Structures are given as structure tokens and as C-alpha cells.
Amino acid sequence: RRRSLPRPHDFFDAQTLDAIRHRAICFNLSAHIESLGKGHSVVFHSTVIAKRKEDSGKIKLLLHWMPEDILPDVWVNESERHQLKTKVVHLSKLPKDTALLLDPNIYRTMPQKRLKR
Amino acid sequence: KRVKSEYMRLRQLKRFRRADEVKSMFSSNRQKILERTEILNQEWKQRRIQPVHILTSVSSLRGTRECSVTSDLDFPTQVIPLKTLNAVASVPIMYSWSPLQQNFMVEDETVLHNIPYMGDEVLDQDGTFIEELIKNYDGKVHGDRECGFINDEIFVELVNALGQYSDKIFEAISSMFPDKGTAEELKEKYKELTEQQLPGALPPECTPNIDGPNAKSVQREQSLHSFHTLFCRRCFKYDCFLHPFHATPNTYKRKNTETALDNKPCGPQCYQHLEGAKEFAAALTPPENVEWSGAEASMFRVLIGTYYDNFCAIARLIGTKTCRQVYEFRVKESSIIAPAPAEDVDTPPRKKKRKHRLWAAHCRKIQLKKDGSSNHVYNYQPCDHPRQPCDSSCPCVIAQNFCEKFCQCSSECQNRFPGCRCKAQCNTKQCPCYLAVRECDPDLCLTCGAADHWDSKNVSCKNCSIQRGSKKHLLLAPSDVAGWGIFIKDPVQKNEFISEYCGEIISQDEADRRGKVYDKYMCSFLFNLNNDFVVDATRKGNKIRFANHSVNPNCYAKVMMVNGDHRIGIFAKRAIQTGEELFFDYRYSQADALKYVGIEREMEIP
Amino acid sequence: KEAAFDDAVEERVINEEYKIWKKNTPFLYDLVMTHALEWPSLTAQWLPDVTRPEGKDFSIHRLVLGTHTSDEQNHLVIASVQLPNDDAQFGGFGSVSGKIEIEIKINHEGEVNRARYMPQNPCIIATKTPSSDVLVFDYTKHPSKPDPSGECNPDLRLRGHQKEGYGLSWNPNLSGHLLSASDDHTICLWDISAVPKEGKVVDAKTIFTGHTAVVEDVSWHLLHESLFGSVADDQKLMIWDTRSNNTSKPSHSVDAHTAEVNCLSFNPYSEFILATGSADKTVALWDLRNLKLKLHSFESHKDEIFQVQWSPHNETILASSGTDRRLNVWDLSKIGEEQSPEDAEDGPPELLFIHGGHTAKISDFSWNPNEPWVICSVSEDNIMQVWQMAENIYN
Amino acid sequence: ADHELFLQAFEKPTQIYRFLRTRNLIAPIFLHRTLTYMSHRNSRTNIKRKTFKVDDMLSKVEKMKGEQESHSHLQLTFTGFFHKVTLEVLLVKVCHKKRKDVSCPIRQVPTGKKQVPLNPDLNQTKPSLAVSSNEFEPSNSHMVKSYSLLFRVFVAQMTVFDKNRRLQLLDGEYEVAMQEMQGPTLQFTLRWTLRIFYQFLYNNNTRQQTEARDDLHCPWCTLNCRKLYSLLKHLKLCHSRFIFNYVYHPKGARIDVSINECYDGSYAGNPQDIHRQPGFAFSRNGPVKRTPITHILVCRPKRTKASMSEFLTYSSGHNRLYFHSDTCLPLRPQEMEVDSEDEKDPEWLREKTITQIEEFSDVNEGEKEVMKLWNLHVMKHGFIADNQMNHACMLFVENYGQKIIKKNLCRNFMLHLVSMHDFNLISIMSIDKAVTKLR
Amino acid sequence: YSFKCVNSLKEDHNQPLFGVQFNWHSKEGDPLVFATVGSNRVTLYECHSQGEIRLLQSYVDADADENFYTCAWTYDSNTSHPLLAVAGSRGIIRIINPITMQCIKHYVGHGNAINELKFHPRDPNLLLSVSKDHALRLWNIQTDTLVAIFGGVEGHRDEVLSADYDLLGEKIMSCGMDHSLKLWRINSKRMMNAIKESYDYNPNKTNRPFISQKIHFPDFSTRDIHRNYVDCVRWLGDLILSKSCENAIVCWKPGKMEDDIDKIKPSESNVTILGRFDYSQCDIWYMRFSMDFWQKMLALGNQVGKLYVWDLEVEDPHKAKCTTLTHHKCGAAIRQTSFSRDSSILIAVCDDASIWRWDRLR
Amino acid sequence: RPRLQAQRKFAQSPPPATQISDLSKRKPKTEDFLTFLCLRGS
Ligand SMILES: Nc1ncnc2c1ncn2[C@@H]1O[C@H](CSCC[C@H](N)C(=O)O)[C@@H](O)[C@H]1O
């Protein structure tokens, strides 16, 4: 090499920088990955769902989380009230079949519509 | 000077005369303006175009940049987020050029005819560079500061202010208008005006064409005078673009014994086969019924110099001539003209058993000792004057070059070589032509096979490729070091040929004049060719020029002479595989090389 | 349509990831060698015979591919590969000119999608079916230089199919037996062991149809000459036994993944085990005797999977590829093994290292039966890669 | 002065890898536990043989011990609504996403609509029923996903099966809050029948001072590197967009980052598609042709030990894209074979000889015509040698014999042969051959 | 005819602009939409009346420090859409479709910077491009192919910075740094044959690349017309409207007065000047000019912003017109003028990234 | 001399050190800080 070697044309054009820039804004104002998500995780916010009455006086609770990326709603015990209001799931333990819905730049089929198989 | 005022008054009189011409032309062209703009307007009215939508913003504008446009007066400062259109891989800087595989001499006129653009910032700090640039030619510019240009009548009337005193009047007019600039050309201009004609776009002796309707009889030399003055012997092409016309005509001997004119009956139409006519022909070794026209006489005067012996061929060539009348016309011409000498020499003694080796040994001492201390390699210039037969005044001798076939020296001059004795690919140290750093010329080197298989472009004889022109396949691609580069799509072995660094053959002075702007423009193309010529490839050339230079180049460029002309040859220093940029050392001066070509490809890896 | 914008953005993303993977290769692989082809290949199956030249530190391998030309005549191609067959085999490692050669090129009518050679005679390779007819090519007789005078006149062609297919597998135990799948919902049986007569056309020996959707693969058992498994797109694979004289009654009524399943392969070193991969982003293995019971399913992929390969050099090493732009090797020995959260968050314990040397869908891949660990992977991007793990994960 | 240029220069490397963090955590291009210098992870040593006759028995035992979920028919009874009316419900069966399905298809099965109380008050109860058919079969319901229930009054949804196909419900009274359009709700029941520091380096005259926390975790890809050497090595390998230099801090270590000076290899796909206009670029709908290239980066690494002191590419192919010399136009790989774009007779020089010959004064077109044509021919074939020109004259006559015969320029053409013989180029015999072929 | 205006603009980026062109292809009654170029952003503008100028979304090539010098309007024959072609210092021509607000085609092949472009008035898919490397590039947008070049040394020998078509689009006149003014005839058989072949070429149709040619030799050349660098040309019937920094626009034609504009061979070098205009303070080059569509009126910007406006008729050039319009705040330089389809709107460029609109009192 | 001069073309005429939250100060440079340390990271 030498002192003034030219820089090859960066394939990452500026409009892709703008797209990732806007994605950064939306994810900083939606999930707060840096602060709430601890950088490596996504926070899920539960809401008020239906409550079912079992044989005992205690009522089995149901919680569905706001992002609803891939997790299905599952019944929880009565103790989950005010304790499972906010949960943080690492990106790794999110399901590996249907979690792409949080953002479609995270993963997509590059050929998309395939002329061949 | 009052000459300019008188010229202006005369031009004003001419403009008063042409005030109707300009008015009529303006009216006529305005009619065409209307008639050609109405059709365009009607075509636009024919079809419909989709209007552009109002300003809109995408959801990604939050992360995208936003711009505003303000107004000087009371208008809202409208804003709109930018749209980042996708970028492209821009090519490096390049300058257009006409492709060619040979050279092209360029006239050395000391006229700039432009002033190159410069940064406009360093000039404020130091604008002396343009002054140094123009001072090299002369402290002027194209058009100078005269600010005067008028018609021929006005220029003539400029001298009319002092014409009653002419030389002084013409000098004043020349000082007024830089178009002519000399009172001496006024004499030739006035001679042409008094003749009310010119030399003409034809032979001046009233003949438009010798083969045209003006079938006037002319002498042999005059007919070929325009032919030979425009025929260059070096490149063999009429009106050469790389050789001057300052040369003697084809006043050379020939094998006159070839035209034997063997005794054979040529039929009734024959200058021979008639007792009186044959007797006259034998002595020269009834009158014609048809009088040959001027074209026939003119062509006879030319074909006699080529085919003195046989009348049949001359009659066969001339349409307006008959071989039966050939004897009578020859008698009449020889009565009215003179014969030709047709010089030839015998030179009985000859020996090639060892004389070739003795001459080769003699050439080595000159080329090593007497030519290595000259510090200059003058451009090849054949000598055609008997004023110094193999002496110290023949240009081929003072330049230490060889009096080859193209030089008018003796047919057996010792200052020439018999070509390649070796058949061993003409590139080893046993090759005399490789030893003399010159491509073997095919008509002499019958051993290496340069003349053998002319149609073949894969000659087994190396060191003759430029003569064959069989350049390898080269591909242009951007260079990782700087600017463009040249990349080869095929592997190249030891000392294999790559295309010649073609360009413009120009004198040392003109090349140095161009170097002053090349240094500022940083895209130089000049390294010396010979003590008289330097090849410039900025305007013409090929893909070779894109090859850069590094401290460890992969090729080597040796400036080398081909067929009496110096050509910059490119050969690979080492074996280079496919897809590698070609680098050859420029032999560049160390300080100015580090100033210009100091960029290195590979650092100190070990 | 916003698909194009996202596609371009993710194209730049995949370029960035390919660069990042490329610079991580020396501390990830013991051997990375990527190659580009004039036209893409949908078949990547290492030839079994590998020649080892003496003295030099590299061996001469041969690899079967196929030109997928979208403009001109497609050609069946066999490409040779040099690999560092030496302990100290450190320009590169061997000859610096011919690490990739295209010495064998044979004309083919249409592109090659799934080519599989003969274990019994690798000179005979079937180019599957970009037609209604399955062609047979013997690369020994065909010239090295592809003559453009039409097709290469295949030695034999097989009737029985109607539409295209992507499944192919030769009988490892019986000579001259082939089964192939197609979109016609059908698998055709062929007997190429004896073709004495003229015409050079061999009809289907027996048509097999027991699936309600497209069949995409079929394979014979290596320790069972008559028992062969089949898989289809009706979320169902089915095991077929010959000599039953029934084209619709399966030997064992079984069901595949909840979604479309496209590949089926057996392990050579066992009598019962069978593995398959589906479009449900999962690869699951079955058994010949435990049909109904589910042993395990692999959930590392994210898109459809249509290729599975048991490592010939081991019994418990598996590999699979799909449109996920990833290549996964499976080590069944570590199935369900407990591991620290750092190991778990990277991937499941049974999953070996995930190969990521591609920019498109991995069309096909295979392991050469000569070197203990060797595997190539092709793609529609003409990206030809031969990669090896660093020894640290398997000692 | 502003430092926004520095932030803009470092932001492009930043956000790229920050998004790649999510992309790789969801979809790892490689397992981080399998890296040679990350090998402190993946503690599961490969020591087992795992004969194929142990997993079948274990799976059979697990299946025998499993099957905890049980079922018979699903039933339910409606109590009413509440607001601060006839009701309609539906049964939906969902199939997993197939190749021809963009997403998982949902198919609904109608049932019998009934009436519900219009938000009854307390103690207002004083009968509506819906029953499900036992159509759940392993063969019929193999391809279906977990079933779900539709409720409309005001639409609600709730499933029945769990992740492992187990029942998620039970026979009991359900108080369901309705997602209309406290608050809307519905009532009913169901029945069954060390420390490190960071530094940023660009225009080092001034910079924004930085600090570091969560040392073993990378700031960009949030990877926990339990070895300090491996952290810097991973930064070097996965973050070429930065240049890291280590200095021993008085209270630990310190890393100074700097934007890459060159950062080569920006694009690695087909070079032909770099310059192409949008729409036709990066299509991949069908096969595309690219020049064959061979690139090798790993052959046999020395596999040195993890040494801290270490901190203070072969390729044979066309690679880069080639452009036309004359027009600076990118060259198609298929056109590459014959697009030499260089031949002995350029057209511009063909017109140049015509213009310069015709331009001269003391000669007329009667001779300038042949003067122009001979140059055209000789420069078309590029003759060099004298014996080459002896047949160059013959080839001139061969090319233009019919044209001259229809043109009748023999006498003017005779001047060319005279000049040829005056220079001894054309022999006497070759003079006649230019005449017989002329007619 | 006299122009009056109380209005001005100014772009925030503050680097000089280098050309404005109106969308003359807009139908009757469409809003007056014109393009502006310069400072790595393509800023389109919309004008209706009352001095209001409405911006369109600017397209920025922020990948490098590009300088833009070229705008040129055209329409798509296939879909009837307004297209704009922009080229800059990087030697890259960009085609952006404002209807979709996104670029569609780019063109590469320029060895150096690119000056102002003009579109073929008869065939909308043909675009001629000047270049800093003494070359002239003509393009076929409908097939994205390159057609014959005018870049040989026989053409311009230095920086070409102006070109124009005639009204009928038959001949091309251009000027460069070397004071040359040369004519290339589109109506020459070779040229429309090349154009027809360009419209007939598809890259997938044949493996052979589109065989373009090189046009080194124009049909006329002259240098003595202007002693300084001529930087702008326009067509007035068969005459030439050229400007150089001798502070004078001149009118002239090849050949003599009676010489036909079509039969004149390149050998003839006679030049007759039949018109000249005068102004003040034409010191800095690139100070281009343009006419209205009807060519009835001419204006030229000045470095102090003076707009010397002259109505064109069959009258004598000596006293053609002496009308000058100037605003007290337009002291910045001006390098390009543009007119609407009618003479109603005249809008020029400046050096301080300011945009000025002049309104006709008709 | 008037025509010999060069064509000049124109007229002659938060500071304190920040943790990895500073990284969060550069992807979302606008649209709220998303964390209080970004203000200290300015
Ligand atoms: N290795 C190198 N690094 C930087 N500049 C170089 C170079 N080799 C040549 N040059 C420059 O290029 C000119 C020689 S011609 C070299 C190729 C051509 N100019 C191009 O850029 O594509 C010289 O003026 C020199 O300044």
C-alpha cells in the first residue's frame, strides 16, 4: 500500500443509510433497545386480557404481549398479575420460525417470487 | 494608427453596400424560424403529458435529510425532505483520444490556440504559472490584444492610408491586423490578385487532370511531380502523416535487364515485325495513319521511362495508341525529344563466406565505443546526397545509424547489416537485431521468418511483432493505484510482446512545450523517445498509456527503433497471469518520479 | 410495490454479512476456497473417486455440476477441484493455476436441477428432468469440448414423467435402478441394468403414486435393496416397498412435517434410521420401525429446506441446506445435551457450525467420501465454495 | 466549527453493525461458539459415539411417559355481555405456511348463530349453547396448525390448543374483556363432553472523549467475549469499518477505534450488475452470467495459541469489471471474448487521409481520387514490407477491379504503377497483372 | 414585452447553481414546472402565478462531493411521463422520474466533467451530452445504448462546454475552450441509421455489443470568430448565436451569404458575421444564454445580474434593442437563462444558490 | 495582455466522557434521546 490509495466504491449507498437511520429512530422510540432492551433483547409489554375462572377461587390469568412478534398467548397463574407486566426476551430465545415480523429487513427471502422452485 | 481607421471606413462602406443583404437574410431566416417553430408548437399540442404531483414526504423522512429554500422577499421558506437517489460507480478521469495502431507526426507550430483551465485559487496566490506557460512560446495569446479583424477590402484599404507613399503601407496594415502580420506576403497576394487567379486545385499548367478532359501532352517529370511530391517513401502511403516531404524524387536506378522484350510476333499491330520499322527499332535499340492525341503523347512520355524495350506493353497500356503506330510515334518523339540513360552497374567481385562476419564485427566497435559515448540517439534520417559516400557528412553516419534499404547509399554499403542470421526466435543474444535493439525488418531477415507466413499473426520470430502488428489481447479496467489501468486477459511469459506505446512523433522542443502544461495537469505522458522525437499520447494512442509505474513493475519499456522509426515497445519483465494490471518502469528521474509517480502498490511486506 | 426497495436494502445487508463472514474465515475454517462459474449450478455432488498425486501437497478431486444458462445452450459439466491433501499443506497451497478446471463439458437439453451419479459406475450420471424425459449421460464418451450442434445425444432417455422434478437417487444395492420425483405427484421406477435393444429409450418400469400433492424426493435404503422411502409436498412422506404389486398401498403409512417436505436421505451406517427436511424450516429424522414415534426435529433454519446429507465418514453426522442462505451440519451425538446459556443462545446443542459462505440459496451440497471432512455448496449466484470446519469443534 | 462530519463518518459503520446485531442474533451467519478464539464457549466436548439403537428406545419411553393431554367434545354456554343482542361465532382451522402460501392460510367453518343478553345487569340470569364436532383426527388434522375460536357481537379471538398440541382451556366460567371496535367485556362458560476504555480516532486534533462499560460485551454486536484477547480479535474480524489500537491503561486496558482508511472489497457479487440501472440490477429472477473467479482466504492456518502480545488473500480471476476503452462503457462478460475494440484501420484515419489528400492545393481530384483510394486500401490491410506491397497493389486491384472498370480510371491508375516501379517496388511482370485484373 | 419582478429565492446549501430548464413538454394549462441543477442536488420547482415558486422533492447524490451542472427535460413516448436528465462533475448522467420521485436510469462513459445538456426536439429519447474531455455523447434513452461519438481531435481539442440542435434537429453546433465552433449534421444518413439501430438494440437480443461508431470530423470549423473562449451556442434558423468573453454575442453562418447550409462541404472555411450584440461586464466565462421557444426575444445574464433583453426581428443588429432589466439585489453572478414555452416566464441561475423569476408584462 | 490573463471564473474579491450510550447518541441523532445519557453524551 501507500499514503493515498483510493477508496473503492462503497456498495452501501446513502439511501440505505437513511433507511437504517429511520429504523434506528423507530426502534429507539418503540422498544428502547439500548436502555430497556439492554442492547441484546427486546421488551414485550403485556396488556389486560380475558380472565378465566377455574374450580378454585383463584382465576387463571391470560396475557398477550404488545409486540406479538412470534409468541402465542399462553395462560398464566394469578401471581402473574402486576409481575408479568413487562418482560424482556433476548433475540436468541425468540422463536426461529415466525419472529421475522418485528421488522422485515431482519430477514426476508431474497429471491422472493421465484421463477424456478 | 490611421490604417485601422481607414480600414474601418472601407468596411463601413462595404456594410452600407451589404445593408440590404443582411436585411434580406434576416427576413428570410425569420420566415424559416416561424415556419419551423410553428410545426414544433403544433406537435407539442398534439399529445398529452402526465403532470407532476405536488410535494410529498415518505415515512422514512424522519431519518432522512431535509432541505429548505428561503426567499429574499416576503415568501414562505418552503421545506422538503431530500430523496437520496441511488449512487453509481463513477469511472476515473479520462480524456478522449482517437484510436490508432501507428504514429502521427504533429506540426510544431508555436501557437497555443487555447489557454488550459487552472484551479483559479492558486493563481490569486501565485498566477505566475500561466505567464511562464505563455512566455515559452511568446508573451502572447491566440488573437493577441490587437482586437482587429476586417474583410479583405478593408485590409487592403488600410494600406491605402499610406499607399500613395507600398512597403510601409503594407507594414502599417500588418501591424493593424494580426491576420496577415507581414508586409512581405502582400507581394504574393498582389501577384495573385493581378493574375486574378491562383495556382489552382489542379496542375497549374492549364490541365485540371492529366486523365481528365484536358488531355494535354506533358513531360514525364511534370505528370509525376504532384504525384511524387505527395508520395512518401517511408510509410509508402501518399501524404504521410509521420514523415516530411523534404526528400528527393524517385531518381534511382533499376534492373533494366528485366525488360528483355523477347522476340515474339505481336500481330499486325506491332512497332516491330515491319522491315523498315524493325530496322529502325534495331538501330534505335511509314507514318502512322492515326495521330495520337495529347493524352497518348503524355502517357508515352511516362511509360518510356519504365518500358523502353517492348512496344507491345506500352501500346497495351495506352488506349489512344497502337503498336503498329508505336514505331512511328517513337521516331517522331525521339526526333522531338531525347532518350534516357537507364543507368546500371555490374560490380563483379563479391564474397559472403566471411565478409558478413567481418562487417558484423566492425559494427560492434562503433555501436559500443563510438555510439555509447555520444549520449544521444538521433532520429533515423536517410541520406541521399553523394556529397559524403560513407563519409562523415551523411546523416546516417553522424547519427551512427545504419544506411539501410531506405537510405540512398550504395547497394553494397558496409553501413548496413544483412539482417538476422539466426533462426532462434530473434530474441536471444545471438540475434544481431536484438543485439542492435531493433526489430528485424522482414525483407532482409529471411532466417527468423519475419517475411515467412505474412498472413500468420503468431510468428515464431519474436522481436518482430510491431512489424506484424500482432498485439496481444488487452482489456481496460480502473486501476487500484490511480486512474485507469490496463489488464491482460491472457497469461504472458518471459519477454513476450505487449502493444506499442503509440502516440504523436513531435520534436524535442514541442514535447518540452507540452510538458509545461502536463506537469500542472498531473496526467503526463512524456518520456523521451530519441534525441529528436518524443512520443506524445494524450491525443492519440491505445490502451498501453493506462499502464502505471511502480518501484517493482511487472513489465519493462525499452525505447527501440523499428524500420527507421523509433517506437516505444512494451515487454513483460516477469510472467504475468490473467487479471493483473501492467506496470513498467518509466526509468523516471527519482525526485520527479517521487513527485509524480510516488504511489506504491505493495509495501515492505517482508 | 415496496418489495423492490426492501430487496435492494437487504441486498446491501447480505453483501455486508458476506464481507464480515469472509474476514472471519481463517479463524472459522481450516479451508475456504470460493469460486465463480459462468452459469449457476443446481447440483453439487462430489464424485466418490479422488486421485492423490504424489510428492505435491494437494489431491485431484472431481465434482459434478450443471450449467443453468438462461440465454444459450445448457451444458452438463464436471469440474475438478484441488484440495490440500497434506498435513503441512500450507500463492495458495498447491499449483497456483488450476485449482478449478472445467475439463468436462457435455451438451444438455435444458438446465440441470438435480444430478446424481452411480455409486456402481460414476461415469453414468442422470441429469434429472427439465423435460418429461430423464436423460442418461456417460461422460467418458462425450467430448471434453462442448459441440454446439444440438444436444449431446444422450445415451438413454427415460419415459414416465410429465412435468419437472427435483428428486433423484440411484439404487445403492441393485444395479441400474433409479427413482425420481416430479410435480405430477408421481415417482417412476426405471431398470437401466439391461438395455439390449435399440431405440435408446427405457420406459418406466412401474409408476408409483400414493401422495395427494407434489413429490420432490425419493431415496433407497443402503442396507435394504427393496425398501425405499419417498417424500412429497402433502405434508406427508411415505415408505414404499417393491414387489408388493401395488402402486398406491404403502409398506408403512407414515406422515411428514406439518408443512411441505422436499428431501429424504438415509444414513449408510445404519439399518433403520431415516432423515428428511421440510419447508417448515425444520429437519426431522425418522425410523423404519418407530414410524409413528417422533425422535427429534431440528429448528435452526428459517426458510424452506430441500436438501439433507448424512456424512459418509460418520454415522452420527448430518447436514442440510435450504433457501435460508445457510448450510447446517448436524451432530446427532450431542442431541439434547445440556449446555451453558452462552452456548444455547448461539444455537441448539445438536446443531454443529452453520456455514454462511453464500449470497443466494444453496441449490445443492454434498460430502466427498474420501477426505474425512469435505463439503462443497453451490448456489444460483454461481458461488462455488468448498469449506471445512476448524478441528476445534470435533477434535 | 462543528464535529458533525466526524459523527456522520462514524455513523455509517455504526448503524450497519447495530442492525446486523439483530440480523445475526435472529439469523447467525456463523455460530459464535464455534470460533477458534471464541472456543471458550461450546463446552460440550465431542466425546460421544451415540449408537443409533439408544435414541429409539429413549423416544419410546418418553412417548409412553408423555401423552399428558387428553380429550373426549368441546362445549360452551353463553352468559351475556356488558357495556358502559344476537351474537355470531365462527370456527377457524389454520394450516401451516406452504410454498405456494405467502403466509399461513386460515380457513373458517360456520356454526349456528344464537342470541345473547344485551348487557344484563346484576342477578339478571334466569341457555344458548354451542357444541363442537369430534372431527380431530391424526390423518385429517396432520397439516393444520393450532385451532382457534372466533367471537363477534366487537370481535375477539382465542385459541384452544397449546404449543405442544395440548389443551389450553378448561371447563369453567370465563370473564372475557371484549376488544370493541372495566370497559367492554363478555361473560360465558366452557364445558367438556476489570475495566476497559474506548477512544475514537479521526482528525485527532480534537475528539469526543468516550468511556466503556460492559467490557466483555461488544458495543456493536453485543457479544460477550470472556477473553480480552478474543474481544479485540473479534472486533478486528467482524468490524473492519474500524481500526483498533491497544494501549495499556493505568487501570486496565484501552482500545482506540478509527474509521477504516481503505476498507476494500465493498462489493463481491457479479461485477456486471454494479453499474446497471435500477430495475434490471440485482434481479436474480433468472440465471445471470458472471466471469469465472477463484478466491482463497484459508488454506491451513498456523493455529497459534491465544497470545495477548499479538495486539499492540490469494485470488486468480478477472475480479474487477472491465470497460470499453473507446467509450468508457462497461463490457458484457459474454461480449468479452471478441470485443478487442482495436484494429489496424480506424475509421477516423480513413476519413483523415481523404480529407487531407483532397485539401491540398496543387493537385486535382482526377489524381486525388486514386491517391485517396490507395491509402484506404493499404491502411485497411496495413502493409509494412516491400514484398507485402508488391501484393498490396494486387489486392488493391482485386478489391476495386469492377469499380474501376465501371469507373474507367486506368490511365490515372497507371500513374500509381509508374511510381511503384520508379521506387522498384513493383516488378515489370506485376505491372501487367494490375491491368488484366483492372478490366 | 418588458419584464418586471419582485421575487427571489435562495438555496440553503449555498454552492453555485449551473442551469435551469423549463418543462416545455407540459401540456396547455399545466403549472410551470422547471428544473434547477447544482450543488449535488436536483431541485425541481413549480410556478403558477403571483410570484409563488413551489419546490419539488430534491434528489441528492450524497455519496460524494458531486457538483451538478446539467438539467434537461424530456418525455417518455411509451408511458407519457416527464423525465429529467441530470449530469454533473463526476461524468455521470442521471435520469430521475418525478412522477415516481425516484431515479430510473444512469449512464456512464464520460471521461471527465459534463456541462449543460439539451434534448432532441424531434425524438425525445435522444440526449446529447458535452464533456470536459473534448467529446460529445449522444444517447438512446429508450434502449439505454450509446450511439456515435463526436470526440476526436478533429472535433474539439479542449473542454467542450456548449451544444445545441437546430429547430428541426438536423445539425449540431458546439463550442469549446479552443475557440472552435464545429457543425455535426444529424440529418446525415449515417446518423439516422445509427439512431434507428440504437432504437432496435436490446442487450438480451444478441450477444454482440451495440456497434457504435466514432464521428471525429465535423462539417465545418472556425476559430477567428471569437478571440477568447466561447462558452455558449444557440441556433437561430441557419445562423449561429455564440457568446465569448469579449463582452459581445455574435451572429454568423458557415460559407458565404449565398452558400447553402446543406451543400457546404467541410473544406469550405468562409465565415460571414451578420450580427453582433453588446453589453457590459462579461468577464467570467460560463455566462450562457438562451431564447424563448419562439426565438422572438433574447436575454443574457451578467455577473452583476443585469439582464440585457433584446427582441429579435428582421431589423438591423446594430440597433436591434437596448432594453436592460436589473434588480438592486441581484448583484451575484448569472450563468444561465431559461424561458417558458411562451415568453411569460424567464428564470435564471446565480452563484449564491439564489433563484430569480422574471415576469413578462404581456 | 487582456486576452492572455487566466480565466479565474469568479470574482477576485455533554463534553464529559460517555459510556456506550454515546453509541446511542449517534444512531438516533434526533427524535428524542431514548436515554438520559445521550444528553450527557452530546
Ligand atoms: N503508479 C502511479 N501512481 C500514481 N500516479 C501515477 C502512477 N503511474 C502513473 N501515474 C500518473 O499517470 C500519468 C502516466 S499515464 C498512467 C495511466 C493513466 N494516466 C491513468 O491514470 O489511467 C503520469 O502523469 C503520472 O502522474
Numbering used by the authors:
A (entry chain P): 179 to 295
B (entry chain C): 17 to 181, 220 to 339, 426 to 746
C (entry chain N): 4 to 93, 106 to 410
D (entry chain A): 81 to 152, 156 to 167, 182 to 223, 228 to 254, 295 to 322, 351 to 362, 426 to 544, 556 to 682
E (entry chain L): 80 to 441
F (entry chain B): 108 to 120, 138 to 166
Show sentences the authors wrote.
Polycomb repressive complex 2 (PRC2) trimethylates histone H3 on K27 (H3K27me3) leading to gene silencing that is essential for embryonic development and maintenance of cell identity. A central mechanism of PRC2 activation is the recognition of PRC2-trimethylated lysine peptides by its EED subunit, resulting in conformational changes within PRC2 that lead to the allosteric activation of the complex.
Analysis of the cryo-EM data of PRC2AJ1–450 bound to the H3K36me3-modified nucleosome resolved two distinct states at 3.1-Å and 3.5-Å resolution, respectively. In the first state, the H3 tail can be seen binding to EZH2 and entering the EZH2 active site (referred to as ‘tail-engaged’), while, in the second state, density for the H3 tail appears absent (referred to as ‘tail-disengaged’). In both the tail-engaged and the tail-disengaged states, we observe JARID2K116me3 bound at the allosteric site on EED. Consequently, as previously observed for activated forms of the complex, the SRM is folded and interacting with the SET-I helix of the active site, and the SANT-binding domain (SBD) is in a bent conformation (another conformational feature associated with an active state). While we cannot totally discard the possibility that this density could correspond to the N-terminal residues of the histone H3 tail, this tail-disengaged state lacks any of the other contacts with the histone H3 tail that were previously observed in all other cryo-EM structures of PRC2 bound to nucleosome substrates. Similarly, the binding geometry in the tail-disengaged state relocates bridge helix residue Q507 to a position where it can no longer interact with the H3 tail as is observed in the tail-engaged state. The mixture of tail-engaged and tail-disengaged states observed for PRC2 when in the presence of the histone H3K36me3 modification suggests that this mark impacts the efficiency of PRC2 to engage the histone H3 tail.
